[PDB]
Design a protein around this motif. Structure first.
Motif, PDB file in Angstrom:
ATOM      1  N   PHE A  57       0.812  -1.205   0.000  1.00 20.34           N
ATOM      2  CA  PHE A  57       0.000   0.000   0.000  1.00 20.34           C
ATOM      3  C   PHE A  57       0.849   1.260   0.000  1.00 20.34           C
ATOM      4  O   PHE A  57       0.633   2.152  -0.826  1.00 20.34           O
ATOM      5  N   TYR A  60       7.856   3.830   2.341  1.00 20.71           N
ATOM      6  CA  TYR A  60       8.373   5.100   2.849  1.00 20.71           C
ATOM      7  C   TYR A  60       9.742   4.870   3.463  1.00 20.71           C
ATOM      8  O   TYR A  60       9.838   4.317   4.563  1.00 20.71           O
ATOM      9  N   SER A  76       2.907  10.702   0.327  1.00 21.88           N
ATOM     10  CA  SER A  76       2.136   9.478   0.514  1.00 21.88           C
ATOM     11  C   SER A  76       1.808   9.282   1.986  1.00 21.88           C
ATOM     12  O   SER A  76       1.102   8.337   2.340  1.00 21.88           O
ATOM     13  N   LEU A  77       2.318  10.155   2.850  1.00 18.36           N
ATOM     14  CA  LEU A  77       1.879  10.149   4.239  1.00 18.36           C
ATOM     15  C   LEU A  77       0.829  11.242   4.393  1.00 18.36           C
ATOM     16  O   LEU A  77      -0.319  11.051   3.972  1.00 18.36           O
ATOM     17  N   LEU A 117       8.628   1.747  19.219  1.00 21.19           N
ATOM     18  CA  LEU A 117       8.503   2.991  18.470  1.00 21.19           C
ATOM     19  C   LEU A 117       7.267   3.761  18.935  1.00 21.19           C
ATOM     20  O   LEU A 117       6.168   3.205  19.007  1.00 21.19           O
ATOM     21  N   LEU A 119       5.158   7.141  17.856  1.00 23.67           N
ATOM     22  CA  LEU A 119       4.890   8.250  16.961  1.00 23.67           C
ATOM     23  C   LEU A 119       3.983   9.244  17.670  1.00 23.67           C
ATOM     24  O   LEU A 119       3.017   8.854  18.337  1.00 23.67           O
TER      25      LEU A 119
ATOM     26  N   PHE B  16      -2.954   3.758  16.351  1.00 24.61           N
ATOM     27  CA  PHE B  16      -2.487   4.122  15.021  1.00 24.61           C
ATOM     28  C   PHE B  16      -3.477   5.064  14.323  1.00 24.61           C
ATOM     29  O   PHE B  16      -3.074   6.055  13.701  1.00 24.61           O
ATOM     30  N   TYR B  19      -3.411   8.551  15.662  1.00 23.88           N
ATOM     31  CA  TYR B  19      -2.228   9.264  15.180  1.00 23.88           C
ATOM     32  C   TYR B  19      -2.426   9.757  13.753  1.00 23.88           C
ATOM     33  O   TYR B  19      -2.071  10.897  13.423  1.00 23.88           O
ATOM     34  N   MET B  20      -2.994   8.911  12.893  1.00 19.58           N
ATOM     35  CA  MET B  20      -3.203   9.293  11.502  1.00 19.58           C
ATOM     36  C   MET B  20      -4.232  10.409  11.395  1.00 19.58           C
ATOM     37  O   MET B  20      -4.083  11.325  10.576  1.00 19.58           O
ATOM     38  N   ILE B  25      -4.893  12.469   7.860  1.00 20.12           N
ATOM     39  CA  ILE B  25      -4.955  11.470   6.806  1.00 20.12           C
ATOM     40  C   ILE B  25      -6.413  11.100   6.574  1.00 20.12           C
ATOM     41  O   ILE B  25      -7.166  10.862   7.530  1.00 20.12           O
ATOM     42  N   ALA B  33      -5.056   1.303   5.738  1.00 20.54           N
ATOM     43  CA  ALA B  33      -3.741   1.160   6.347  1.00 20.54           C
ATOM     44  C   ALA B  33      -3.812   0.403   7.664  1.00 20.54           C
ATOM     45  O   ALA B  33      -2.838  -0.254   8.049  1.00 20.54           O
ATOM     46  N   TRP B  51      15.954   4.044   7.533  1.00 19.93           N
ATOM     47  CA  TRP B  51      14.871   3.103   7.774  1.00 19.93           C
ATOM     48  C   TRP B  51      13.876   3.149   6.629  1.00 19.93           C
ATOM     49  O   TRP B  51      13.692   4.177   5.972  1.00 19.93           O
ATOM     50  N   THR B  53      10.024   1.582   5.789  1.00 25.04           N
ATOM     51  CA  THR B  53       8.821   0.905   6.246  1.00 25.04           C
ATOM     52  C   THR B  53       8.008   0.456   5.045  1.00 25.04           C
ATOM     53  O   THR B  53       7.770   1.234   4.116  1.00 25.04           O
TER      54      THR B  53
HETATM   55  C1  RET Z   1      11.481   4.681  13.486  1.00 26.71           C
HETATM   56  C2  RET Z   1      10.418   4.446  12.540  1.00 26.71           C
HETATM   57  C3  RET Z   1       9.512   5.332  12.082  1.00 26.71           C
HETATM   58  C4  RET Z   1       9.511   6.768  12.509  1.00 26.71           C
HETATM   59  C5  RET Z   1       8.461   4.897  11.179  1.00 26.71           C
HETATM   60  C6  RET Z   1       7.185   5.316  11.227  1.00 26.71           C
HETATM   61  C7  RET Z   1       6.113   4.903  10.363  1.00 26.71           C
HETATM   62  C8  RET Z   1       5.118   5.681   9.867  1.00 26.71           C
HETATM   63  C9  RET Z   1       5.030   7.153  10.157  1.00 26.71           C
HETATM   64  C10 RET Z   1       4.092   5.092   9.017  1.00 26.71           C
HETATM   65  C11 RET Z   1       3.247   5.758   8.200  1.00 26.71           C
HETATM   66  C12 RET Z   1       2.213   5.213   7.339  1.00 26.71           C
HETATM   67  C13 RET Z   1       2.460   4.232   6.457  1.00 26.71           C
HETATM   68  C14 RET Z   1       3.796   4.015   5.796  1.00 26.71           C
HETATM   69  C15 RET Z   1       1.357   3.517   5.741  1.00 26.71           C
HETATM   70  C16 RET Z   1       0.121   4.369   5.517  1.00 26.71           C
HETATM   71  C17 RET Z   1      -0.251   5.152   6.767  1.00 26.71           C
HETATM   72  C18 RET Z   1       0.893   5.991   7.354  1.00 26.71           C
HETATM   73  C19 RET Z   1       1.007   7.253   6.494  1.00 26.71           C
HETATM   74  C20 RET Z   1       0.541   6.414   8.783  1.00 26.71           C
END
Ligand code: RET
Lengths: 133, 133
Positions: A57, A60, A76-77, A117, A119, B16, B19-20, B25, B33, B51, B53
């Motif tokens: 989906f 990032y 995309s976020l 983690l 956020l 989650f 947060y979104m 979002i 998601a 990193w 994801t």
């Molecule tokens: C240390 C790791 C970090 C800061 C990673 C964080 C992950 C996110 C902010 C994830 C974001 C999202 C996705 C990649 C999938 C769709 C929904 C989001 C935008 C919340």
């Protein structure tokens, strides 16, 4: 050519919904699937084929140096520009994302065998736990 | 313990969606998601920290041989069992998936630097194009 080796990324996908109803896929699953991109890796040895398809989906990635500010675009976020800075607080990696959102960033730290983690945006905190593969 | 290198696999997710939503979002992206698995890869090299994801919906492997019929399970797809025969019609890799669905199969071929795929089931035809990422 019959050589189909390679990692392929989907570029276009039409009537995917109609094909999905033909297989009796439930409507909620069809909602996810139409927004997913697909990567298809073929490993071919003559007439012997092995290929893997992964449906994602949102990908990032980010690359930075601890203690050096960097501009970050969250495409995309939420698609915002922020001025990010990541530092160590002992064993906790701490990132502040300066921009429109207050209290925006994350915290990442090893505890035992696992990655934690957190956020943060505004008054919202998301807490996540990972195990290492 | 600052070494966070690894392939990390999410075991729990708290708040989650809150947060979104704090990030604004849209509702539909949040609904998709939150039904997905997240894999986190961390490449750490001194003070350089990368990193990546990935949010994946489904994954699928298969190995076969042209001319040989084979029992197949569309695991993580629509999850049916079929008898699949993959042949060459010219320089086009065509497949027929025998089973409890009429007219199921696919055709795949290369032209230039792009992979063309057509998924067929019932009266439905899905067309996809791949670029060699
Ligand atoms: C240390 C790791 C970090 C800061 C990673 C964080 C992950 C996110 C902010 C994830 C974001 C999202 C996705 C990649 C999938 C769709 C929904 C989001 C935008 C919340």
């Amino acid at each position: 050519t019959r050589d189909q080796n390679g990692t392929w990324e989907m570029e276009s996908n039409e009537n995917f919904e109609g094909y999905m109803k033909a297989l009796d896929i439930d409507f909620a699953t069809r909602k996810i699937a139409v927004r997913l991109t697909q990567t298809l890796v073929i490993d071919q040895d003559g007439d012997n084929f092995k290929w893997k398809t992964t449906s994602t989906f949102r990908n990032y990635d980010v690359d930075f140096t601890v203690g050096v500010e960097f501009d970050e675009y969250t495409k995309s976020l939420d698609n915002r520009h922020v001025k990010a800075l990541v530092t160590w607080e002992g064993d906790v990696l701490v990132c502040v994302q300066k921009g429109e959102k207050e209290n925006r960033g994350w915290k990442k730290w090893i505890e035992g065998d696992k990655l934690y983690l957190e956020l943060t945006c505004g008054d919202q905190v998301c807490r996540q736990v990972f195990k290492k593969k």
